[PDB]
Amino acid sequence: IDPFTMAAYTIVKEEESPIAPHRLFKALVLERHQVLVKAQPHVFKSGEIIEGDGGVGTVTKITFVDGHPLTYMLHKFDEIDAANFYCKYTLFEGDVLRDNIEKVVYEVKLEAVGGGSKGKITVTYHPKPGCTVNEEEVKIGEKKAYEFYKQVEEYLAANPEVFA
Ligand SMILES: COc1ccc2[nH]cc(CCNC(C)=O)c2c1
Ligand SMILES: COc1ccc2[nH]cc(CCNC(C)=O)c2c1
Ligand code: NA
Ligand code: NA
Ligand code: NA
Sheet holding 86-94, edge to edge: 9-17, 116-127, 101-113, 86-94, 72-81, 59-64, 44-51
Q: How far is the CA of 144 from the centre of ligand 5 (A)?
A: 8
Note residues around ion ligand 4 (Cβ under 5 angstroms).
Answer: 64, 68, 71
Determination approach = X-ray
How many other C-beta atoms lie within 10 A of the C-beta of residue 64?
20
* CATH number of the domain within which 19 lies: 3.30.530.20
Question: Which residues form the domain of 95?
Answer: 1-164
Resolution (A): 1.3
Evaluate: CB of 43 within 6 angstroms of ligand 2.
Answer: no
Q: What DSSP string describes 29-76?
A: IITHHHHHHHH-TTTEEEEEEEESSSSTT-EEEEEE-TTSS--EEEEE
User: What is the domain count for the chain?
Assistant: 1
At 63, give phi and psi (nearest 5°).
-115, 130
Which among 6, 11, 34 is positioned nearest to 107, based on CA atoms?
11
State in Å, rounded, how far the first CA of the chain is from the last one.
47
Evaluate: CB of 40 within 6 angstroms of ligand 1.
Answer: yes
Q: In angstroms, rounded to a whole number, what is the distance separating the alpha carbons of residues 13 and 8?
A: 16
The most distant pair of C-alpha atoms in the chain lies apart, rounded to whole Å, by 54
Q: In angstroms, rounded to a whole number, what is the distance separating the alpha carbons of residues 8 and 126?
A: 5
Q: Which atom of ligand 2 is nearest to the CA of 151?
A: 15
